[PDB]
């Protein structure tokens with residue numbers, strides 16, 4: 001069996017165990033700023049991602065086993081205007097050599113691709129439900145399951161995600177401690193059919209393709225563990 | 230700082246680190262059977278509880294600190310008839326010398342008392358919402374917050390509960406892996422005002438006070454951790 | 459499988475997860491003071507012990523399994539005179555209802571009894587090697603294996619103890635960080651034959667039976683984990 | 688603070704979280720075979736290394752903090768002849784882009800270089816003590832501290848290594864469970880002066896430069912954790 005875990009209570013400004021992609025950087029104060037901010041204001045057309053350095057072994061063809069994992073993190077999405085926001089932030093798993101894919105509504109994750117994501121989606125695209133939502137996405141920008149999400153501007157959101165290999169159940173929840181409000185969604189997801197044996201895990205985010213649809217996507221901490229047995 | 234954690238993938242038939250109260254017992258196969266079963270059928274008027282042996286330090290008056298904790302477990306509630314069920318199962322915290330309190334709708338936890346509970350309530354009492362529900366209860370059988378719960382007869386439910394001391398946020402969720410359906414509720418709870426400095430943690434359950442309102446309340450596993458710093 | 463672990467970076471002055479026996483107490487500053495101190499000076503004829511509250515499951519007759527465990531702690535033994543010292547401090551495992559046994563050279567552990575101990579023995583009794591020593595003791599005050607120990611008056615000692623069930627190997631080591639000096643001893647120990655299925659773990663210590671053979675026995679921290687599978 | 692840990696109870700034959708260097712490979716049965724074996728016999732002039740994929744943050748110049756870490760593993764060194772053996776196996780820390788250095792007595796680690804190692808040295812070079820030894824090495828093939836080591840041909844050795852940042856104490860021990868025999872050495876080591884802020888950790892080994900001084904260097908498992916706070 002092979003267990004792997006890590007925790008950051010904040011991020012190091014030059015983080016060698018984190019692969020930063022696109023616009024992503026860590027601030028002096030240790031926030032993982034996925035999308036660009038200039039003079040303290042979020043900018044449009046931005047895409048950033050961050051992956052943990054070590055690959056994770058999520059299934060093994062030889063032994064026919066699948067990993068179980070769990071992760072928590074908290075994040076903030078702040079927009080200068082509440083009524084126009086885009087595009088969102090996601091936690092994801094993809095092949096180890098994964099690179100940024102399409103910006104805007106594609107969240108840096110998908111395009112016209114093996115990636116499973118839990119998305120916190122702030123803009124209704126042609127493929128989306130009408131309301132902001134938390135979605136579970138398997139190799140598509142279209143979610144197989146979602147829950148309507150009452151996004152709170154600038155408030156810290158706490159997230160817990162777990163995957164139980166014995167039942168193929170992926171569950172994601174979000175809670176705003178400021179008003180004790182929570183949301184949850186689950187799905188049956190076969191990681192062996194969706195992903196390769198080894199993946200990297202992390203975050204992706206994009207700001208809108210227009211000046212009036214901008215927001216930040218900052219991650220404040222992160223813990224992860226996975227066991228393959 | 231003082232960290233305490235434990236995990237059981239199943240329970241030992243004579244469990245010395247578990248204080249069994251009322252009707253509670255562990256089966257030969259390692260299930261924690263909180264309420265009585267006779268010839269394989271659940272019996273009425275039953276009350277059982279189970280506490281971890283070691284007290285947990287949840288706050289300290291001298292240093293003014295409060296613990297954060299998290300717990301997962303899975304459980305089954307099976308009734309011979311889906312339309313009449315009672316009374317439910319709870320995870321709870323109470324003083325270390327806690328003893329069983331009122332049966333039936335009081336869940337073994339409350340009466341006409343310092344106890345904080347997350348309840349999985351299968352019968353609408355005079356104090357309850359109309360539907361089955363998951364409730365967060367602070368020193369009362371009346372929940373301060375609840376979510377409507379679509380109870381699935383005989384299916385395994387997975388539970389995750391966390392408490393973040395820095396925000397006083399208690400969150401509880403339930404997922405049925407069989408159909409990837411989930412529920413979540415949160416509340417702001419001040420553990421210093423509700424509970425003493427040291428508590429014991431565990432489970433309580435009760436079957437109905439009538440022959441036609443019976444069900445099992447079995448816990449299949451359990452993991453817990455708490456940190457005070 | 460059933461995992462249990464705990465860590466204290468210091469001890470609480472009124473510790474509910476620690477069963478204090480004999481003279482043992484926790485100081486205002488959070489040291490576990492096993493033997494008596496009066497006006498800051500150690501007193502003779504003292505015996506103190508401390509056990510973690512939860513029993514540990516070290517073997518199971520039904521499944522024929524044995525636990526593996528590991529523990530670290532640091533401690534200080536300070537004597538007003540380096541040349542006359544007694545009697546020592548031990549880490550031990552015993553039945554859950556274990557009570558203090560003979561004082562002086564018997565270390566609170568043995569007498570004229572199921573207890574396995576790793577002893578840090580500061581006085582040569584009729585049954586001891588000539589020099590101060592670290593011993594592994596199985597149901598006897600006579601050690602089955604020992605290593606000569608250059609005790610450093612008043613210096614912090616770091617201890618690591620592990621037990622590998624697959625090989626029945628118990629190993630104990632001590633290091634003084636002040637001068638990077640270390641000692642180690644191991645033994646083959648069958649826990650099933652020496653101990654019952656469930657035990658409590660902790661510390662015992664005794665000061666000499668004469669006024670000129672006194673010392674402190676203080677534990678500064680402690681971490682423990684055990685897994686039965 | 689930032690915690691990182693991993694455990695392997697055996698190694699995967701194509702291990703993506705392990706960077707294999709030189710001759711190192713993982714066998715079908717999951718052993719990490721650092722030096723070459725042909726027809727089941729060890730070959731001369733071999734050098735292999737293995738590093739965990741994620742860099743470890745061992746100190747931070749900005750916050751002036753240093754990590755504490757601990758690691759266990761077990762290994763086998765088997766020679767066809769007990770009286771002529773070379774060269775040995777080591778656990779080490781080096782910059783993330785570390786590459787194999789000199790073969791033979793240099794253990795793949797050093798040359799005519801920032802690397803700190805705990806070495807299990809089976810051949811007395813001009814720079815070595817006369818007997819086989821366990822050494823602590825800071826930027827040199829010459830050990831600053833060592834203990835004489837009674838190497839047991841083909842027996843499993845269990846190793847525990849810890850580093851306490853608060854005292855700068857590095858300690859390494861080895862135990863053979865087959866005959867309950869153990870060895871320990873410690874040293875004061877300043878990781879900030881010896882190493883860069885970020886390192887990779889792992890193993891290196893070399894077989895002798897002559898046909899009559901060959902042995903295997905196989906690692907059977909591995910666990911590691913480090914915390915920077």
Ligand SMILES: CC(=O)N[C@@H]1[C@@H](O)[C@@H](O)[C@@H](CO)O[C@@H]1O
Nearest residue numbers: 086087104105106208209210213
């Ligand atoms: C297809 C696509 O990326 N569409 C984007 C959408 O995601 C959002 O960024 C919007 C903001 O005005 O701009 C475009 O419509």
Ligand SMILES: CC(=O)N[C@@H]1[C@@H](O)[C@@H](O)[C@@H](CO)O[C@@H]1O
Nearest residue numbers: 315316333334335437438439442
């Ligand atoms: C007050 C109280 O415990 N009421 C109980 C209720 O909880 C449930 O057990 C019911 C089943 O017929 O019987 C009584 O009404």
Ligand SMILES: CC(=O)N[C@@H]1[C@@H](O)[C@@H](O)[C@@H](CO)O[C@@H]1O
Nearest residue numbers: 544545562563564666667668671
């Ligand atoms: C048998 C026994 O406990 N002997 C004790 C010995 O352990 C030590 O305390 C000594 C100090 O003067 O006093 C007695 O000899």
Ligand SMILES: CC(=O)N[C@@H]1[C@@H](O)[C@@H](O)[C@@H](CO)O[C@@H]1O
Nearest residue numbers: 773774791792793895896897900
């Ligand atoms: C300097 C150097 O690597 N010396 C090596 C020594 O380490 C060992 O491999 C020996 C075996 O015959 O061969 C050479 O002497």
Ligand SMILES: [Ca+2]
Nearest residue numbers: 121123125128
């Ligand atoms: Ca969208």
Ligand SMILES: [Ca+2]
Nearest residue numbers: 350352354357
């Ligand atoms: Ca009710």
Ligand SMILES: [Ca+2]
Nearest residue numbers: 579581583586
């Ligand atoms: Ca003695």
Ligand SMILES: [Ca+2]
Nearest residue numbers: 808810812815
């Ligand atoms: Ca050598």
Ligand SMILES: [Mn+2]
Nearest residue numbers: 121128135143
């Ligand atoms: Mn969407």
Ligand SMILES: [Mn+2]
Nearest residue numbers: 350357364372
């Ligand atoms: Mn209710």
Ligand SMILES: [Mn+2]
Nearest residue numbers: 579586593601
């Ligand atoms: Mn002795």
Ligand SMILES: [Mn+2]
Nearest residue numbers: 808815822830
């Ligand atoms: Mn050497």
